[PDB]
Design a protein around this nucleic acid. Structure first.
Ligand SMILES: [K+]
Ligand SMILES: [K+]
Ligand SMILES: [K+]
Ligand SMILES: [K+]
Ligand SMILES: [K+]
Ligand SMILES: [K+]
Ligand SMILES: [K+]
Ligand SMILES: [K+]
Ligand SMILES: [K+]
Ligand SMILES: [K+]
Ligand SMILES: [K+]
Ligand SMILES: [K+]
Ligand SMILES: [K+]
Ligand SMILES: [K+]
Ligand SMILES: [K+]
Ligand SMILES: [K+]
Ligand SMILES: [K+]
Ligand SMILES: [K+]
Ligand SMILES: [K+]
Ligand SMILES: [K+]
Ligand SMILES: [K+]
Ligand SMILES: [Mg+2]
Ligand SMILES: [Mg+2]
Ligand SMILES: [Mg+2]
Ligand SMILES: [Mg+2]
Ligand SMILES: [Mg+2]
Ligand SMILES: [Mg+2]
Ligand SMILES: [Mg+2]
Ligand SMILES: [Mg+2]
Ligand SMILES: [Mg+2]
Ligand SMILES: [Mg+2]
Ligand SMILES: [Mg+2]
Ligand SMILES: [Mg+2]
Ligand SMILES: [Mg+2]
Ligand SMILES: [Mg+2]
Ligand SMILES: [Mg+2]
Ligand SMILES: [Mg+2]
Ligand SMILES: [Mg+2]
Ligand SMILES: [Mg+2]
Ligand SMILES: [Mg+2]
Ligand SMILES: [Mg+2]
Ligand SMILES: [Mg+2]
Ligand SMILES: [Mg+2]
Ligand SMILES: [Mg+2]
Ligand SMILES: [Mg+2]
Ligand SMILES: [Mg+2]
Ligand SMILES: [Mg+2]
Ligand SMILES: [Mg+2]
Ligand SMILES: [Mg+2]
Ligand SMILES: [Mg+2]
Ligand SMILES: [Mg+2]
Ligand SMILES: [Mg+2]
Ligand SMILES: [Mg+2]
Ligand SMILES: [Mg+2]
Ligand SMILES: [Mg+2]
Ligand SMILES: [Mg+2]
Ligand SMILES: [Mg+2]
Ligand SMILES: [Mg+2]
Ligand SMILES: [Zn+2]
Lengths: 187, 159, 53, 105
RNA sequence: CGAGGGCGCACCACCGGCCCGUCUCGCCCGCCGCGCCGGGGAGGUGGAGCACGAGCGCACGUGUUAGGACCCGAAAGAUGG
RNA sequence: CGACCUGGGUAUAGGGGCGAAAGACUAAUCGAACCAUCUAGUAGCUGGUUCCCUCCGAAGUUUCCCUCAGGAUAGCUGGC
RNA sequence: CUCAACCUAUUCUCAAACUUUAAAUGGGUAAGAAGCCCGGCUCGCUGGCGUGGAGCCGGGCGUGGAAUGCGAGUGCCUAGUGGGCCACUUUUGGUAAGCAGAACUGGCGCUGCGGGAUGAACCGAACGCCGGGUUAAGGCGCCCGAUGCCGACGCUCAUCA
RNA sequence: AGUUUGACUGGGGCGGUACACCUGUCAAACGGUAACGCAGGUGUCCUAAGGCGAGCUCAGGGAGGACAGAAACCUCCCGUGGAGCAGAAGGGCAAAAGCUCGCUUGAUCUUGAUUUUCAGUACGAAUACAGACCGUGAAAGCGGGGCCUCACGAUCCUUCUGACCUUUUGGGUUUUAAGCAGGAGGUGUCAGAAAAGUUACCACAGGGAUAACUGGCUUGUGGCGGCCAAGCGUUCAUAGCGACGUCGCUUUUUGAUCCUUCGAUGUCGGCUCUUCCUAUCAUUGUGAAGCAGAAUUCACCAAGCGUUGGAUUGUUCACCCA
RNA sequence: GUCUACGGCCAUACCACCCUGAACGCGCCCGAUCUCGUCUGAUCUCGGAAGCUAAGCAGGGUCGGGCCUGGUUAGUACUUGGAUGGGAGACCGCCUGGGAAUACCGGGUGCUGUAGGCUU
């Protein structure tokens, strides 16, 4: 007998996409080969993002992509996102962008192309930059989800600002005892 | 079954040492406590204001806030299987500077200066402190004296 | 019993609901029947507008 | 306990210390038209008997004395409620105690 | 290959900033209604907030709950015969 | 030979009847008959709960509860 | 003259709720790059002062400032459980208990296997299906594997060994 | 008619509160740590016993002084606190925190942070700040209750106080009502139902988580022995006894416990019948004596054999007759 | 070599008794008009400078008490971890590490900071 613990032997991580999308599986095959047969760590990151779930591949708005592309030294670089690129109607000027995405919204696609931009899929990105040279790997806001407002410390604990689960919002719904000093306590 | 009183079981802990009662010496009030320095929480019983709780006596923390008479200390407390950093206000009577941090700062000043001097004259010197090494070989001289022969003594009944 | 975080739910199923349940399996048949009546009414008022006044 | 009938304490209306006139607070009379009383009377009417609990397990023997402070400044008659600790015997402006006096034989 | 240097995703810690409530202080501004009118500032603090959206619909799984509610089981209570 | 025994006909029906009184009797059922229904009544309690292999793997402790054969809560577990 | 009280210096014996003194085991912290050292700037706080303190901005320092071992950090959802029991040691009540109640670690519960004839908890050791070798604790007259050693030195006779 | 008739608990009931709190101890030198563990305490009290400042020194003892004495008052000396600080205890405290005076109301109005219990929820209590308005002192400062560790209470409802505040439903005025913020009226089963019994006429779901009867552990108590030998025995410790002590054994007493049994192990006594034990009443063989004989007593090997008939009582026991 | 004022550590500094003290100083001392307090100019407050180191104070002394620090007590008491060690138990021994406290016997009896004086 040996003195070890076996509760952490099996690392919990995606070794493949749980999706049955045959097109996603094809470009997983392409980037499984690229990650193995190159020393590019860019291919390793892209490959493991391809396995990720939809909640782990948040959409990237056009405004956020433009703002990251506008940073110094990123001219003539390809914006790579492993997910959906989304139109942001809050912006009025779209510059010229070279973009690779898993998926682009129709309105966002029209805006990028009309501004002289270029849109690539991940198969075309492999031919353009097999090692991912001259690319900016972007990601949508991972915690930009309603669930994360409810996560954290319990709402009925001091110094916790987490949203409780309520069927309705109003003066009659969970605004009394434990929420104000007049009604017992507040914390 | 035990009471939850704040000072239960502090009969001897907060009592003064023998023949050291009375007026608190004033050097304990003249000590300077900056932010980020390490202080030991004693908890003398002569001053009843700003006393630490019994679970912080003999604990060491880091000062994060300084007031007119007290300091704010971040001190680790273990509650069941979790250690969480408590923040407590303690009057300066119940704290004193920790010499563990003072000795290490002295060593850093020696280390940094010793490195500087070594570069100026050239050769390499040891900075890290090593654990007590095994004793080296040596000669023990008899000096013309035969070592005294010891013998266990017979037993006889004391009292 | 409550279990961890959740929404305080108040279902209105304390009133013997299973004896008053309205299924909609006749919805496709109802749409057909009204459409026959619409077509029959339009034929009856032959030149008059089908929708009415 | 004993408290004087007058004291100089803070007045929120004046924003400063002013002499105050100290009296004991009593609970006022029930309105009968308070919303809870109206709801209670509607609930009690008809059949069903007593519809709300009746305490009948008194344990306390004292009440927290509430002092009604009135600012004496005639422009400002603002009143405040001060609560002191529980006491069995409360007196308002009684005879002050002396020290070096013979206790009446 | 590469010492160094640069732009830095997401995310984390922290410091600022903005919106609503409420306190403290204080000085200005607006006019078809000069008012018991309207607006603005600084400093704390309360909010399930903002700070270049992530949601909606459908399906599946797990968990909790109301329903006969995993299955079988009272002593009883009521209505009408 | 009696407050005697007995047939038949009548009357009293369920929280009601009837009782020389035993809570007796009221269709083998009586300290509240029988039948159908509400009703698959409720049960923190007892009993049961149906194929295989692989991997991980506990707790009987904290706090609160008309709480002490039960829950909530933290802890310990697994999965992602 | 004697016996007392009292005082003084001694003397016998003690304390879970006494103590001058005071362990072992034990609890906290530190052993650097978030550090050190140079300059400078901001403040409505502080102020004899270019003060004090805090914050901010640049620059230079790597011998990475004990040993040993190990890859870490972080989030969501969550079942079962919430009758325990036993052993060494510490330990409370009790005459005591296979009694009742705590502390610490391990175990049984959830665990098979070798040994203790037998046995939840002892001793050894933890387990996929097998071959060879060797052991642990325990054993080697026979049951029953192994002393069928020319084993060593003594002790002991029991008519309940 | 409907309903209720707490909980803990070496079974339940009765008794207690170990049900909300506080001190010392248990507790094994951080902290935490249980038993209907030990010793106690709490539901109050205080316009001062709160807050400042000043000035003093306390308990006790010695020596003196009219009435005066063991204690009345005055004086000196010693006095580490051996006093006092409201109360239980512990800690703390001397030109203090104690005593006496003087002036006072910081026991006032506010927002957050933190500690304690802890889930790191609440209440309660507490600590350090910050913003007002004050008190005291010459001032530094100290004070937002009591030297510290306890002295206390949610939602709903009611009551009072505050904003020339909000709403009061088509608009306006005024009552009224509702609201916002802060106190109070209380839940002591103290995180907070509104609650009397009885059942042997009883019922159901369960429980060997839990009593009554056997068994098991234990052996205080009961019973039976041993060691020492101060004494008893005219005399003489030990023929026969055995005080003060002390070591055991037994499970035919009674307790202690609750491990097995609550989908059931038929619960006293007697009758009948068998067997077993020996700690032997008799009988066989013996040793001892305060054994002359007779009788009796102590002890050994020893359970082969026997140990009865009756009155009263259900009795086991008991007592008497023979 | 000392002192005064303010101190830090707070007896190696305290307590009892004895001896010495030059110069400044600190005191004792004289007085009560003013300031201020008293039953009392005793204390406190104020105004002084005849006298005195008697006292405080400083230094020294005592087979002094205390205190401080060593030795002994003693590798003893106690103790972490270990054993299919001993013993009926009570307890005890050993292995592996740590390790006290009285009595008894020695040594010591304030160091020092800032500012200002005296000491031929
Ligand atoms: K993980
Ligand atoms: K206790
Ligand atoms: K206690
Ligand atoms: K269900
Ligand atoms: K019927
Ligand atoms: K007849
Ligand atoms: K009936
Ligand atoms: K129970
Ligand atoms: K759980
Ligand atoms: K649970
Ligand atoms: K303890
Ligand atoms: K609190
Ligand atoms: K002041
Ligand atoms: K109110
Ligand atoms: K309760
Ligand atoms: K016995
Ligand atoms: K027995
Ligand atoms: K039993
Ligand atoms: K049974
Ligand atoms: K008989
Ligand atoms: K008989
Ligand atoms: Mg293995
Ligand atoms: Mg495993
Ligand atoms: Mg206080
Ligand atoms: Mg911020
Ligand atoms: Mg859930
Ligand atoms: Mg009913
Ligand atoms: Mg069913
Ligand atoms: Mg049924
Ligand atoms: Mg309750
Ligand atoms: Mg069960
Ligand atoms: Mg259970
Ligand atoms: Mg339990
Ligand atoms: Mg036990
Ligand atoms: Mg038990
Ligand atoms: Mg089990
Ligand atoms: Mg296990
Ligand atoms: Mg096993
Ligand atoms: Mg075996
Ligand atoms: Mg055996
Ligand atoms: Mg083998
Ligand atoms: Mg064998
Ligand atoms: Mg053989
Ligand atoms: Mg009970
Ligand atoms: Mg301990
Ligand atoms: Mg302890
Ligand atoms: Mg004073
Ligand atoms: Mg203030
Ligand atoms: Mg309670
Ligand atoms: Mg009857
Ligand atoms: Mg049992
Ligand atoms: Mg004799
Ligand atoms: Mg059975
Ligand atoms: Mg049977
Ligand atoms: Mg039978
Ligand atoms: Mg015999
Ligand atoms: Mg001496
Ligand atoms: Mg040893
Ligand atoms: Zn006023």
């Amino acid at each position: 007998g040996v003195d070890i613990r076996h509760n952490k032997d099996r690392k919990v991580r995606r070794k493949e996409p749980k999706s049955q999308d045959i097109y996603l599986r094809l470009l997983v095959k392409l980037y499984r080969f690229l990650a193995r047969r190159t020393n590019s760590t860019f291919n390793q990151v892209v490959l493991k993002r391809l396995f990720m779930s939809r909640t782990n591949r948040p959409p990237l708005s056009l405004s956020r992509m433009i703002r990251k592309m506008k940073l110094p030294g990123r001219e003539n670089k390809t914006a790579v996102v492993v997910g959906t690129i989304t139109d942001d109607v809050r912006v009025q000027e779209v510059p010229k962008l070279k973009v690779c995405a898993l998926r682009v919204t129709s309105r966002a696609r029209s805006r990028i192309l009309r501004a002289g931009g270029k849109i690539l899929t991940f198969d075309q990105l492999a031919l353009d930059s097999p090692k991912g040279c001259g690319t900016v790997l972007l990601s949508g806001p991972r915690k930009g989800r309603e669930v994360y407002r409810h996560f954290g410390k319990a709402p009925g604990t001091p110094h916790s600002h987490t949203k409780p689960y309520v069927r309705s919002k109003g003066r009659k719904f969970e605004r009394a005892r434990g929420r104000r000093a007049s009604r017992g306590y507040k914390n | 079954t035990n009471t939850k009183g704040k000072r239960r079981g502090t009969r001897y802990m907060f009592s003064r040492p023998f023949r050291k009662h009375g007026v608190v010496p004033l050097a304990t009030y003249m000590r300077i406590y900056k932010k980020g320095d390490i202080v030991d929480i004693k908890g003398m019983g002569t001053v009843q204001k700003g006393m630490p709780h019994k679970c912080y006596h003999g604990k060491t923390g880091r000062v994060y806030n300084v007031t007119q008479h007290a300091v704010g200390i971040v001190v680790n407390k273990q509650v069941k299987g979790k250690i969480l950093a408590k923040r407590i206000n303690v009057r300066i009577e119940h704290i004193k500077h920790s010499k563990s941090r003072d000795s290490f700062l002295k060593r850093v000043k020696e280390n940094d200066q010793k490195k500087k001097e070594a570069k100026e004259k050239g050769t390499w010197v040891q900075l890290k402190r090593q654990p007590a090494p095994p004793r080296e070989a040596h000669f023990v001289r008899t000096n013309g004296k035969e070592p005294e022969l010891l013998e266990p003594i017979p037993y006889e009944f004391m009292a | 019993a409550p279990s961890r975080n959740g929404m305080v739910l108040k279902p209105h199923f304390h009133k013997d609901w299973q004896r008053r349940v309205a299924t909609w399996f006749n919805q496709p048949a109802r749409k057909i029947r009204r459409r026959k009546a619409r077509q029959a009414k339009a034929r009856r008022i032959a030149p008059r507008p089908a929708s009415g006044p | 306990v004993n408290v004087p009938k007058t004291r100089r304490t803070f007045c929120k209306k004046c924003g400063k210390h002013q002499p105050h006139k100290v009296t004991q607070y009593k609970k006022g009379k029930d309105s009968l038209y308070a919303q809870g009383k109206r709801r209670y009377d509607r609930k009690q009417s008809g059949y069903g008997g007593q519809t709300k609990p009746i305490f009948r397990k008194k344990a306390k023997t004292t009440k927290k004395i509430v002092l009604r402070l009135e600012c004496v400044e005639p422009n400002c008659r603002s009143k405040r409620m001060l609560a002191i600790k529980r006491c069995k015997h409360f007196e308002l402006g009684g005879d002050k105690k002396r020290k070096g006096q013979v206790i009446q034989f």
